[PDB]
Amino acid sequence: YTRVVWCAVGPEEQKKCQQWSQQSGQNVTCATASTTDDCIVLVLKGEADALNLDGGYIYTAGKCGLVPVLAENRKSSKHSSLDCVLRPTEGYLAVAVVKKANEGLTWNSLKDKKSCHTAVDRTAGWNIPMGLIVNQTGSCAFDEFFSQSCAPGADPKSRLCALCAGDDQGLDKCVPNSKEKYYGYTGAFRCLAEDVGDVAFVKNDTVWENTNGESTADWAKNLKREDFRLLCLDGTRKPVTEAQSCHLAVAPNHAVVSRSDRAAHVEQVLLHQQALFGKNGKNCPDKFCLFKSETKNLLFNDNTECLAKLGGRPTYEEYLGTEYVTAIANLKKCSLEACAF
Numbered sequence: 001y002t003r004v005v006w007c008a009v010g011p012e013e014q015k016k017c018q019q020w021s022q023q024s025g026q027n028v029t030c031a032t033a034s035t036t037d038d039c040i041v042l043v044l045k046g047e048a049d050a051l052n053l054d055g056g057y058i059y060t061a062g063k064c065g066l067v068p069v070l071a072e073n074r075k076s077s078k079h080s081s082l083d084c085v086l087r088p089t090e091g092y093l094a095v096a097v098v099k100k101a102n103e104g105l106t107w108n109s110l111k112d113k114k115s116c117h118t119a120v121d122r123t124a125g126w127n128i129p130m131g132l133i134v135n136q137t138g139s140c141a142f143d144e145f146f147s148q149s150c151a152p153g154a155d156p157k158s159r160l161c162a163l164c165a166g167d168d169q170g171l172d173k174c175v176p177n178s179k180e181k182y183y184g185y186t187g188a189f190r191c192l193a194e195d196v197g198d199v200a201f202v203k204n205d206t207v208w209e210n211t212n213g214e215s216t217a218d219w220a221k222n223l224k225r226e227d228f229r230l231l232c233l234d235g236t237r238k239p240v241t242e243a244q245s246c247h248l249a250v251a252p253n254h255a256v257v258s259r260s261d262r263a264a265h266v267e268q269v270l271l272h273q274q275a276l277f278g279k280n281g282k283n284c285p286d287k288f289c290l291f292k293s294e295t296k297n298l299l300f301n302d303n304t305e306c307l308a309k310l311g312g313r314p315t316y317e318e319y320l321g322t323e324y325v326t327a328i329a330n331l332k333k334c335s336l337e338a339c340a341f
């Protein structure tokens, strides 16, 4: 044991971390940086201990040595009262969502349309959908498939950042942090909701969480599921209730990673921290909840019930799985063994 420094990405997660910190009685402190790549860097340097990460990033971090420590576990499909902490994660569904009113749109007609991505390098928002698109077009010219996009983390002056909108003031356009309006699971679905884009690449959960009044935000409060459809790989369209059969891939749950050397200390600190701030936690809701950020998904997706332990003390390849790791490698051949820092 000792204090655990957490790395927050953006001023919003910075604000949330500071609060956790205050409430942990400086048991956990905070370090902020502008992007997840920067936070991976602070950790290698040793100035931060840990952060929660989407699989695509787990891949960046893993090549550099950081290991998965505990994974996100969302409300279980079935009646498993065998603990959340010990219950094996499920993997979330990666889907492609469109407006039902955009009638002729299918997977086979996405060329030249407008797209919304969570962020470059993420599983559902990028790696899954673009990996498939390169594969099918036998061409790495993926910066030219759609006519415009909001893919946070791309070049602000390129096609890919053309639909992004930055912050309140119109600044920080296309930055891969919550300051960019259309970044993340919620930011990319808002991009589609507002009709800035024709298609959004998010997880199944996102569609459900920002519709039928589950979100009281202004852009989403009037959104209904029937007004959306999913794009399957066979070319048909399906309601948002048929995710099970109409998804692009199943995705490894986001997971907390730290440097191998500090992984055990972080593991112990987090299990104790979720005991006071997790779901059914001691100080949640009363004082502070780690898994709540008014649907903004700050430091942890809002639908997390707990951070589970990983059975098999897996490496980042075993945790990300063999299927996915070769998908990310080939896709990345368009721009197989190196830590880029």
Ligand SMILES: *[C@@H]1O[C@H](CO)[C@@H](O[C@@H]2O[C@H](CO)[C@@H](O)[C@H](O)[C@H]2NC(C)=O)[C@H](O)[C@H]1NC(C)=O
Binding pocket: 075, 076, 077, 078, 093, 204, 205, 206, 208, 209, 242, 243, 244, 303
């Ligand atoms: C798609 O996402 C939603 C959101 O997480 C899932 O529905 C929740 O599912 C749990 C059980 O799996 C239920 O107890 C909740 O009542 C559901 N909430 C809503 C809004 O329905 C749904 O299970 C997911 N479906 C797939 C394909 O995984």
Ligand SMILES: *[C@@H]1O[C@H](CO)[C@@H](O[C@@H]2O[C@H](CO)[C@@H](O)[C@H](O)[C@H]2NC(C)=O)[C@H](O)[C@H]1NC(C)=O
Binding pocket: 127, 128, 131, 132, 135, 323, 326, 327, 330
């Ligand atoms: C895109 O295609 C490549 C090549 O088909 C896939 O990589 C192959 O995947 C198979 C089984 O998944 C492996 O046995 C081979 O080792 C892979 N080939 C190579 C060159 O590594 C990749 O999985 C595909 N991407 C997506 C997103 O489906």
Ligand SMILES: *[C@@H]1O[C@H](CO)[C@@H](O)[C@H](O)[C@H]1NC(C)=O
Binding pocket: 001, 023, 024, 025, 027, 276
């Ligand atoms: C912080 O950690 C110390 C050492 O484990 C523990 O005794 C204490 O309960 C923790 N305090 C808070 C607020 O989490």
Ligand SMILES: O=C(O)c1cccc(O)c1
Binding pocket: 071, 089, 090, 091, 092, 250, 251, 252, 253, 318, 319, 320, 321
């Ligand atoms: O393939 C998955 O089912 C899966 C889902 C979650 C975590 C994980 O390592 C794997």
Ligand SMILES: [Fe+3]
Binding pocket: 054, 055, 122, 123, 124, 251, 254
């Ligand atoms: Fe993700």
Ligand SMILES: [Zn+2]
Binding pocket: 247, 249, 250
């Ligand atoms: Zn499947």
Ligand SMILES: [Zn+2]
Binding pocket: 312, 313, 314, 315, 318
């Ligand atoms: Zn192993």
